[PDB]
Amino acid sequence: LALSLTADQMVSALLDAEPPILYSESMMGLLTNLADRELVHMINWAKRVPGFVDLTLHDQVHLLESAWLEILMIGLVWRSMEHPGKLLFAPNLLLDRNQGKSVEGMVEIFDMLLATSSRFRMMNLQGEEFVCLKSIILLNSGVYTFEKDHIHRVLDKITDTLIHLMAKAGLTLQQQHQRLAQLLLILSHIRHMSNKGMEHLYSM
Amino acid sequence: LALSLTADQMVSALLDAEPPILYSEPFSEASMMGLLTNLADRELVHMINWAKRVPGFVDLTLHDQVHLLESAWLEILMIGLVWRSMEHPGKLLFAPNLLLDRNQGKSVEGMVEIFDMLLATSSRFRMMNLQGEEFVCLKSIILLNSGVYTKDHIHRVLDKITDTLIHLMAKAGLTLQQQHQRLAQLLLILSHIRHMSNKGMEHLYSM
Numbered sequence: 001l002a003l004s005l006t007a008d009q010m011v012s013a014l015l016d017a018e019p020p021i022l023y024s025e026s027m028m029g030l031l032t033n034l035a036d037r038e039l040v041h042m043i044n045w046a047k048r049v050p051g052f053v054d055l056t057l058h059d060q061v062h063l064l065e066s067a068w069l070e071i072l073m074i075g076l077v078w079r080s081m082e083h084p085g086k087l088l089f090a091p092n093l094l095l096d097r098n099q100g101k102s103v104e105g106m107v108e109i110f111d112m113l114l115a116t117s118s119r120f121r122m123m124n125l126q127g128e129e130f131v132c133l134k135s136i137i138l139l140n141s142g143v144y145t146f147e148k149d150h151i152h153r154v155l156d157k158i159t160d161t162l163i164h165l166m167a168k169a170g171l172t173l174q175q176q177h178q179r180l181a182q183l184l185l186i187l188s189h190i191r192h193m194s195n196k197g198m199e200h201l202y203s204m
Numbered sequence: 205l206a207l208s209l210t211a212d213q214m215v216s217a218l219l220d221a222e223p224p225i226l227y228s229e230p231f232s233e234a235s236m237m238g239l240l241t242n243l244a245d246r247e248l249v250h251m252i253n254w255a256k257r258v259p260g261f262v263d264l265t266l267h268d269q270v271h272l273l274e275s276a277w278l279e280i281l282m283i284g285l286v287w288r289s290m291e292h293p294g295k296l297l298f299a300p301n302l303l304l305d306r307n308q309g310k311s312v313e314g315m316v317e318i319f320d321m322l323l324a325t326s327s328r329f330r331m332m333n334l335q336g337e338e339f340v341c342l343k344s345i346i347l348l349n350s351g352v353y354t355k356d357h358i359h360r361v362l363d364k365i366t367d368t369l370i371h372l373m374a375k376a377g378l379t380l381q382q383q384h385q386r387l388a389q390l391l392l393i394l395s396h397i398r399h400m401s402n403k404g405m406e407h408l409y410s411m
């Protein structure tokens with residue numbers, strides 16, 4: 001199972017499962033087109049998430065319907081870290097705050113996205129950490145609105161992994177749990193952005 | 205000065221700051237909505253007082269104090285609700301003289317879903333053996349984290365609360381591994397309370 005993998009194997013597995021950075025092929029049409037092409041990859045990525053495929057098809061689908069937008073958003077935020085003030089939706093679709101105002105109600109979400117991006121930059125989020133957070137989001141957003149014990153052992157597994165990475169990075173015990181906490185609190189914001197995002201979508 | 209408190213002082217200050225449990229005054233969609241809102245308005249007053257006793261909160265500008273309370277008040281009301289609904293399986297203790305089960309949620313249009321979410325969370329708390337000391341720490345984190353990205357001072361209090369939480373677990377006898385694992389389970393649930401607050405605002409803003 002996934003419960004038997006070591007911290008290094010979990011990370012290595014997660015890294016190798018990573019989806020590719022897709023390209024942007026009226027504003028909304030590009031984002032939905034890009035988002036929809038991204039969705040196909042997400043699914044195949046989910047199946048590579050240790051612990052995921054051990055669930056019933058119904059649960060696998062419930063977990064994806066629940067977190068797909070948070071997942072797209074954390075990926076968006078991730079590739080935007082080295083472009084302060086901008087959101088890199090795709091290598092050929094990097095938009096800034098002003099371009100957001102273009103669509104109705106999008107400036108509020110952009111600012112939250114940029115803010116979450118600064119936070120990651122300010123924190124120096126590592127790629128190894130990032131893939132862990134993304135998996136935690138997958139297994140955690142639909143888990144309370146549903147197996148369950150399995151999901152919780154896997155989440156503890158990823159937590160161990162996260163801590164393991166910090167230990168190796170050289171952080172002290174106290175820094176380790178302080179960072180884990182900071183990283184996890186950010187998921188609340190991502191959850192919040194996803195909710196706003198859904199509202200913005202449903203109104204179209 | 206709040207950044208100078210020890211894990212034990214932090215706990216004491218938080219438990220002392222705790223606001224009181226209020227009482228409410230078949231239900232129709234109209235009266236039930238009035239009972240809940242009346243209770244909420246009265247609770248909000250004590251929350252603001254409680255907010256001011258949260259280490260580092262008053263050190264913030266008035267504009268930031270208002271932003272934090274404005275974005276987190278429902279999450280705070282709901283975590284309090286979930287907390288006092290632990291011992292009452294399948295029910296929500298909005299107040300002693302107001303314990304509603306899921307069926308009394310259908311009374312209001314589209315509230316039964318918020319109800320199921322709230323109840324599930326209550327189960328998770330019960331299931332996790334959530335302790336009052338841990339509970340006051342989460343509530344505080346909720347307050348300070350809800351609008352922090354929409355600052356340096358705020359993150360130190362948070363780190364202070366993280367250490368307290370761990371401290372509480374260490375004393376309880378959990379191994380280092382169990383400490384980090386429990387810390388995560390607790391924090392991942394704030395993600396769900398956030399969602400509930402969000403669906404809650406939608407429902408409230410809907411009428």
Ligand SMILES: COCc1cc(O)cc2c1O[C@@H](c1ccc(O)cc1)[C@H]1CCC[C@@H]21
Binds near residue numbers: 038073106109
């Ligand atoms: C960004 O504002 C949220 C947002 C608001 C909205 O009304 C519509 C959309 C939004 O994010 C876009 C997105 C595209 C690619 C990504 O990697 C992430 C998100 C797509 C996702 C679904 C429709 C469209």
Ligand SMILES: COCc1cc(O)cc2c1O[C@@H](c1ccc(O)cc1)[C@H]1CCC[C@@H]21
Binds near residue numbers: 281
């Ligand atoms: C199902 O609750 C969501 C909910 C939906 C809604 O449309 C209206 C309300 C709700 O929660 C109630 C609540 C009252 C006391 C508490 O301790 C916690 C929540 C109050 C809070 C603001 C208006 C009312």
